[PDB]
């Protein structure tokens, strides 16, 4: 069972010189394992960037390189540019069939961004279904790490919240994350205090954003 | 200017059978390897197989070597996949690959790619999505940006797609990943951002589609009077 392995996350600064490494379970990778790169960027679109473990593919800048390090292959970045941020993708040839790596997130530095908070309330329409969602906005922020905990009348809430974040941003490589407490509109009504607080690097201190049920 | 588009996805019912296409321009197909690969949700890529230009040599994944079968039209630009004893684990997105294939100097490259097709194995039924309003919680006075979206939930299956304005607005657009909620059915949503001064005066609707089910709404999202 071959198995093909890749670090999960990478982080560089930009200018700065990244390797990203792929390596073989059942030993050394070699030159008849066509080492093959691939480039995700948002919205599930691919590129071939590498062929024959170390040739370019047409359209691929010089920047990117690939080789055999050690009992590896690799994908050598050089001057790293925001517009790397992506996944790459390793695949090695196994005689008879092909075998994709996990991927690896690259993820390019910049400053740190705190994010914009917004606190939406259920809308009238969706109480008469008996379900109430609150729904918490974190606007363009960086880095990603971000904690979002919910308060019911000063309570803290758990395991009735879902998030969701969205690729890092081409242009000013931020991040949005969407936080949702799922309640029924039995024990919505039962509370007057609903509150978003956030935590994140970027905040000298946590970010509040509430409403009063009703209220309005 | 390859181009690669696939379609047949969608729901299809646990031990049954799907088959899937995909159209080809910008190239000369009958001169091309092509390929299937698919990405399961959580997972990263996993290769189905490929097929030479004189169909004469068709490659598998060692697993499915029989459960799926690809073929080719030449005249037609067109890639097949037939999928077959469908099982839970076979739900992920299709996509229809280009393999530039140059044994010469030992090049192979997966160069082109299409968006992929969604396929869901499931023994659930379709649902369309409910569509309720993000309202702005800012008044056109307040002065500055506004955040105003649309929550789309309880749908079945994946995907649904999210547009603004019948996709006049397109900047300040973040339409999130769906989640599945323990209800086994998926949820997301997708905000915008906008002047608080044109709130009034500025039409905000999004357009929201969900072909499993044929459901096509758009709802226009207002600040909540008081
Ligand atoms: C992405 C990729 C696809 C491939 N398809 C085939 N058939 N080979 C093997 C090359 C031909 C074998 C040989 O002639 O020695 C592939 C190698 C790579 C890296």
């Known amino acids: 069972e071959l198995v093909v392995t890749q670090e999960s996350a990478l982080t560089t600064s930009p200018g700065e010189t990244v390797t990203l490494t792929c390596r073989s379970s059942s030993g050394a990778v070699t030159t008849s394992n066509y080492a093959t790169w691939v480039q995700e960027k948002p919205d599930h679109l691919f590129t071939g960037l590498i062929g024959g473990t170390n040739k370019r593919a047409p359209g691929v800048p010089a920047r990117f390189s690939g080789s055999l390090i050690g009992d590896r292959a690799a994908l050598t970045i050089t001057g790293a540019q925001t517009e790397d941020e992506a996944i790459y993708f390793c695949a090695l040839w196994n005689s008879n069939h092909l075998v994709f790596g996990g991927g690896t997130k690259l993820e390019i530095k910049r400053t740190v961004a705190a994010p914009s908070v917004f606190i939406f309330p259920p809308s009238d329409e969706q109480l008469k279904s008996g379900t109430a969602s609150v729904v918490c906005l974190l606007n363009n922020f960086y880095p990603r790490e971000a904690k979002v905990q919910w308060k019911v009348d000063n309570a803290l809430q758990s395991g009735n919240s879902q998030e969701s974040v969205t690729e890092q941003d081409s242009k000013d490589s931020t991040y949005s994350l969407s936080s949702t407490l799922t309640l029924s509109k039995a024990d919505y009504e039962k509370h007057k205090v609903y509150a978003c607080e956030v935590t994140h690097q970027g905040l000298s201190s946590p970010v509040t954003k509430s409403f009063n049920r009703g209220e309005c | 200017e390859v181009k690669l588009l696939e379609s047949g996805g969608g729901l299809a019912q646990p031990g049954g059978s799907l088959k899937l296409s995909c159209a080809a321009s910008?190239?000369?197909?009958?001169?091309?390897?092509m390929t299937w690969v698919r990405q399961a949700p959580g997972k990263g890529l996993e290769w189905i197989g490929e097929?030479?230009?004189?169909?004469?040599?068709?490659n598998y994944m060692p697993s499915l070597k029989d459960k799926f079968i690809i073929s080719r039209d030449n005249a037609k630009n067109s890639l097949y996949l037939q999928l077959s004893r469908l099982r839970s684990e076979d739900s992920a997105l299709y996509y229809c690959?280009?393999?530039?294939?140059?044994?010469?100097?030992?090049?192979?490259?997966?160069?082109?790619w299409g968006q992929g097709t969604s396929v869901t194995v499931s023994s659930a039924s379709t649902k369309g999505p409910s569509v309720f309003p993000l309202a702005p919680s800012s008044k056109s006075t307040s002065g500055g940006t506004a955040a105003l979206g649309c929550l789309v939930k309880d749908y079945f299956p994946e995907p649904v797609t999210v547009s603004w304005n019948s996709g006049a607005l397109t900047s300040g657009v973040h339409t999130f990943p769906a989640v599945l909620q323990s209800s086994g059915l998926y949820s997301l949503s997708s905000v915008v951002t906008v002047p608080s001064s044109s709130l009034g005066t500025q039409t905000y609707i999004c357009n929201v589609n969900h072909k499993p089910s044929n459901t096509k709404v758009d709802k226009k999202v207002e600040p909540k009077s008081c």
């Open positions: 690959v280009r393999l530039d294939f140059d044994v010469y100097n030992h090049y192979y490259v997966l160069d082109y």
């Open positions: 910008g190239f000369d197909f009958r001169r091309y390897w």
């Open positions: 097929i030479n230009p004189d169909s004469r040599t068709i």
